[PDB]
C-alpha cells in the first residue's frame, strides 16, 4: 500500500514476546472485525525463515486516513507502556512485494473423521481404513497462538511469507488481514 506503520515491541522479561505478539495479533483481529475493510495488509520485515521466527517488528499497510483512524481508537489502551509506536511514512522506492498467508493442514485427522462421519454416516472402521494418520502434514512456518471470544481455544495460526515479486496488482485482505491477492511492500 501507500503508507505503513512499524510499532516496536517493548523488551519484556516477565512475559515472553510470543505472548505479546499473540495479544497484539488478537487486538488487530478484533480491530479489523470492529472497523472492517478489505485493503489492510500486514508485513513483518524481520522474518528468519531458518528458525521459523517472525521477529520483533511488525508492519501494517493501509492508507493515511485508515492509519490515523487506527491510532484514534481505545484499542491502544492498557498497552502504551508495553510497546513503542511509529509514524505515518511513505513507502520507499523501489520495494519488492510478497504475501502473508495462514496455511493449515490436516495436523491430526480426527476433525476429518468427524466431518466424514457427519457426511457419510458410515462405520468408524471405514473412516479408519479410508484415510490414515499419515496424512498429518508438518509445517516449518512461523505460527502464532490465538485464543477466541466465543469458541475459546488456543490454536497456532501459521504464517507463510510468499516469494519476492516486483509488481503489486489488485487484491484484497480478509477479516484476518492476510493476503488474499493483495500484495504488500517488503522492505
Amino acid at each position: 500500500m501507500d503508507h505503513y506503520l512499524d510499532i516496536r515491541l517493548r523488551p519484556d522479561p516477565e512475559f515472553p514476546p510470543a505472548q505479546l505478539m499473540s495479544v497484539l495479533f488478537g487486538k488487530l483481529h478484533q480491530a479489523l472485525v470492529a472497523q472492517g475493510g478489505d485493503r489492510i495488509g500486514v508485513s513483518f520485515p524481520d522474518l528468519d525463515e531458518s528458525r521459523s521466527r517472525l521477529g520483533e517488528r511488525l508492519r501494517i499497510h493501509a492508507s493515511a486516513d485508515d492509519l490515523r483512524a487506527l491510532l484514534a481508537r481505545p484499542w491502544l489502551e492498557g498497552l502504551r507502556d508495553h510497546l513503542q509506536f511509529g509514524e505515518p511514512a511513505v513507502v520507499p522506492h523501489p520495494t519488492p512485494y510478497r504475501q502473508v498467508s495462514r496455511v493449515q493442514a490436516k495436523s491430526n485427522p480426527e476433525r476429518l473423521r468427524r466431518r466424514l462421519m457427519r457426511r457419510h454416516d458410515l462405520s468408524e472402521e471405514e473412516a479408519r481404513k479410508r484415510i490414515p494418520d499419515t496424512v498429518a502434514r508438518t509445517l516449518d512456518l512461523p505460527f502464532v497462538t490465538l485464543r477466541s471470544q466465543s469458541t475459546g481455544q488456543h490454536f497456532r495460526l501459521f504464517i507463510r511469507h510468499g516469494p519476492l515479486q516486483a509488481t503489486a496488482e489488485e487484491g484484497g485482505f480478509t477479516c484476518y488481514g492476510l493476503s488474499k491477492g493483495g500484495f504488500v511492500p517488503w522492505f
Binding site: 523488551p11 522479561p13 498497552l79 507502556d81 485464543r147 471470544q149 475459546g152
Partner: protein, 293 residues
C-alpha cells in the same frame, strides 16, 4: 571467622490465597453477595473457567501480614557469625529504615500486577486497601492501577502513607494486617486466568483461585538494579536473579553481582557494597531461603 554450615531465614510479608468472585460494575461498593467463578470441563479433556454472562468485573480477595525482625535467622550453627550478621543489619537499619523498600513495595502493591494474565486488556482497574487493626477497619487507601505504570516506582501522598505503614511493620514496632480487594472492568463472557495445575485449573472449594506464591512473586518484583541492562524494568528479587520465562541469569557469579558474593564480602571480607545493592540484599533476606552448604 567463617559462615555457618546451615542457615535458614523464615519469610516475613506473608500473602494469602486469592479467590475470585464476579459481579457487574457500579456495585463496586455493594460487593458482599457476589457469586464466584465456578470451573467447568469441556472437550482431549480441558477444564475451563469463564466470566458470567451479565458481569464484567472480578473481585479478587487476599490478605497480607507484615511480621518484622528480618535479621534473625530461624536456624544457625555458630554464634560469632550470627552476632556479626546481627550487628551488620543493626548498622543498616539504624543508618536507614525500611523506607525505600517499603516505598517500592507499596508501589508494587498499588498497581494490580498480581493479576498476571488477568490485567492486560482491561477497561478499568482499581484497588482498595483496608487496614484492619481490631475486628473493625481503621483506615482506607484508594489507588487507580491504570495511573501507575509497570515501569517505575513513583511518588504520591497516600502511597507514602502506605509506605510508612509498611516500614512501621518491618521495623517491628507494630502488627500489620491488610485486606486487599481488586476490581477489573474486562467484559462479559471472557475466560479467566487462575493458576494451572499439573490439565486442571487451581481451585479452592467450588471457586477458582490463585496460589500464594504467585502473589508473593508478584509482590517482590522490585529489583531494578540488574548489572547488564536496566531497560528490562523490575525483577522478582532472587539470588542468582533469573526469570523462568526469558531464561537468563542476571547477577551471574562471573560478575561480582551474585548475592552470596555480596554477602561474604560484606560480612566476612568486611567490604560494604553500594547502597542499592544493600537494598537488594535486604530484599533477598526478606524473601528467605536456604543458605549454607
Amino acid at each position: 571467622l567463617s559462615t555457618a554450615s546451615v542457615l535458614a531465614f523464615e519469610r516475613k510479608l506473608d500473602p494469602s490465597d486469592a479467590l475470585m468472585s464476579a459481579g457487574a460494575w457500579a456495585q463496586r461498593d455493594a460487593s458482599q453477595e457476589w457469586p464466584a467463578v465456578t470451573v467447568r470441563e469441556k472437550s482431549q479433556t480441558v477444564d475451563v473457567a469463564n466470566l458470567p454472562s451479565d458481569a464484567d468485573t472480578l473481585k479478587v480477595r487476599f490478605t497480607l501480614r507484615v511480621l518484622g525482625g528480618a535479621g534473625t535467622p530461624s536456624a544457625c550453627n555458630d554464634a560469632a557469625y550470627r552476632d556479626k550478621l546481627l550487628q551488620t543489619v543493626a548498622t543498616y537499619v539504624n543508618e536507614q529504615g525500611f523506607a525505600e523498600l517499603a516505598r517500592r513495595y507499596a508501589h508494587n502493591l498499588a498497581n494490580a500486577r498480581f493479576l498476571w494474565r488477568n490485567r492486560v486488556g482491561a477497561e478499568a482497574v482499581e484497588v482498595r486497601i483496608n487496614h484492619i487493626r481490631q475486628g473493625e477497619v481503621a483506615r482506607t487507601w484508594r489507588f487507580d492501577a491504570l495511573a501507575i505504570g509497570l515501569r517505575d516506582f513513583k511518588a504520591d501522598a497516600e502511597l507514602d502513607a502506605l509506605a510508612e505503614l509498611i516500614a512501621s511493620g518491618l521495623s517491628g514496632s507494630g502488627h500489620v494486617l491488610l485486606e486487599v480487594v481488586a476490581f477489573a472492568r474486562i467484559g462479559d463472557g471472557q475466560e479467566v486466568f487462575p493458576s494451572q495445575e499439573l490439565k486442571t485449573l487451581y481451585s479452592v472449594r467450588d471457586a477458582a483461585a490463585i496460589h500464594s506464591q504467585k502473589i508473593g512473586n508478584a509482590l517482590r518484583t522490585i529489583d531494578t538494579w540488574y548489572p547488564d541492562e536496566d531497560g528490562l524494568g523490575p525483577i522478582a528479587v532472587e539470588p542468582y536473579g533469573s526469570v523462568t520465562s526469558q531464561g537468563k541469569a542476571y547477577r551471574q557469579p562471573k560478575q561480582k553481582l551474585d548475592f552470596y558474593t555480596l554477602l561474604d564480602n560484606w560480612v566476612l571480607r568486611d567490604e560494604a557494597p553500594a547502597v542499592e545493592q544493600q537494598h537488594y540484599v535486604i530484599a533477598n533476606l526478606i524473601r528467605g531461603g536456604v543458605f549454607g552448604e
